[PDB]
Amino acid sequence: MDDLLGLLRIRIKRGVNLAVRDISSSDPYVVVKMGKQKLKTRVINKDVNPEWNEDLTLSVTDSNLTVLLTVYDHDMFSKDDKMGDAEFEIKPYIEALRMQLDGLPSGTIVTTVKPSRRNCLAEESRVTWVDGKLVQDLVLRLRHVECGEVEAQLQWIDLPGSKGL
Amino acid sequence: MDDLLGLLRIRIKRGVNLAVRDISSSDPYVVVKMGKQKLKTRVINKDVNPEWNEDLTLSVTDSNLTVLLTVYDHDMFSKDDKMGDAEFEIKPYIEALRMQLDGLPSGTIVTTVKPSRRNCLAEESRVTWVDGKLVQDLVLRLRHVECGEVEAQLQWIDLPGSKGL
Ligand SMILES: [Ca+2]
Ligand SMILES: [Ca+2]
Ligand SMILES: [Ca+2]
Ligand SMILES: [Ca+2]
């Protein structure tokens, strides 16, 4: 709390053309990890295009952390099957939050992160001021799997009585 | 932190038929108070049916507190008029968070709170165990105003390092 910058709300929106790990479908869920914290979405049954629309909220004490993301196919009576992984840096978003831009029309773009051979972006990721909030939109190409993307949006939670940014 | 159970997420979903405090509309926002904490939603312009869909995140160190919700009309260059208020107890939700509900099927209704002459519920409020999460849905009829309801949902955020439930 003396350590707390704020909380990172990771809105896991949807999975797109995810890998088949049963016979003709999968039962996917997302897990994220940032340092010691691990959080998961619910399982969506028999859908390789799952609409999770679920928030995973992590505490942040460091500007330079990496979020790891993975998708699994839930099997009730066997080991869950792999559906791929990705990761992303929070530094750009946190740096943007620290630019202290006071509105700032709706839609202005503060930072753009380009897809690269090393990162997991399927398309450029924009940090934008939207509806009175700074957010980052992400489309993650999944690694170690034959197909699949996960769409997410980062939002920030400030807690009064904490270190802050 | 030594006292902190965790964080209560109050999602302020929407206002329904809120009072007109300008000429033909209002610019509503919600102020939520609990203990020493005071949080605010953004203003929605010229809409008496505002879709805030906004999360307000409160620290919980005392399970016995009341949450007060007050709606106001934003007037940029003048005073902000009251548009009614409601309150609710978080004790039932916290009580439920402390039960053994891992292993309950999704969709299990743990607690139902009925509207009464004393409380602000417009209809029965259910505390539901769903998709591995406990949620409370609330429809609050605003007091001290000619019309208006606010819809909200409680969810819980764990904080590693906290006292916990
Ligand atoms: Ca399988
Ligand atoms: Ca499966
Ligand atoms: Ca007014
Ligand atoms: Ca006004």
UniProtKB/Swiss-Prot annotation, chains A, B:
Keywords: Abscisic acid signaling pathway, Calcium, Cell membrane, Cytoplasm, GTPase activation, Lipid-binding, Membrane, Metal-binding, Nucleus, Plant defense. Residues 1-106 form the C2 domain. Its cofactor is Ca(2+). Disulfide bonds: none annotated. Disruption phenotype: When associated with disruption in CAR1, CAR5 and CAR9 genes, reduced sensitivity to abscisic acid (ABA) during seedling establishment and root growth regulation. GO terms for biological process: abscisic acid-activated signaling pathway; defense response; positive regulation of abscisic acid-activated signaling pathway; positive regulation of defense response to bacterium; positive regulation of response to salt stress; response to salt stress. Its main location: membrane. Changing D75A: Impaired Ca(2+)-dependent phospholipids binding and reduced abscisic acid (ABA) sensitivity, as well as altered membrane localization and PYR1 binding. GO terms for molecular function: calcium ion binding; GTPase activator activity; lipid binding; phospholipid binding; protein homodimerization activity. Ca(2+) 2 binds at D22, D27, D73, H74, D75. Pfam families: C2. GO terms for cellular component: cytosol; nucleus; plasma membrane. The keyword Metal-binding applies. CDD domains: C2_ArfGAP (cd04038). InterPro entries: C2_dom, C2_domain_sf, CAR1-11. Dimers and oligomers. Binds to PYR/PYL/RCAR abscisic acid intracellular receptors in an ABA-independent manner, both at the plasma membrane and in the nucleus. Interacts directly with PYR1, PYL1, PYL4, PYL6 and PYL8. Binds phospholipids in a Ca(2+)-dependent manner. Interacts with YchF1. Belongs to the plant CAR protein family. Mediates the transient calcium-dependent interaction of PYR/PYL/RCAR abscisic acid (ABA) receptors with the plasma membrane and thus regulates ABA sensitivity. Stimulates the GTPase/ATPase activities of YchF1, and regulates its subcellular localization. Promotes tolerance towards salinity stress by limiting the accumulation of reactive oxygen species (ROS). Promotes resistance to bacterial pathogens (e.g. Xanthomonas oryzae pv. oryzae and P.syringae pv. tomato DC3000). This is Protein C2-DOMAIN ABA-RELATED 4. It comes from Arabidopsis thaliana (Mouse-ear cress). The gene is CAR4.
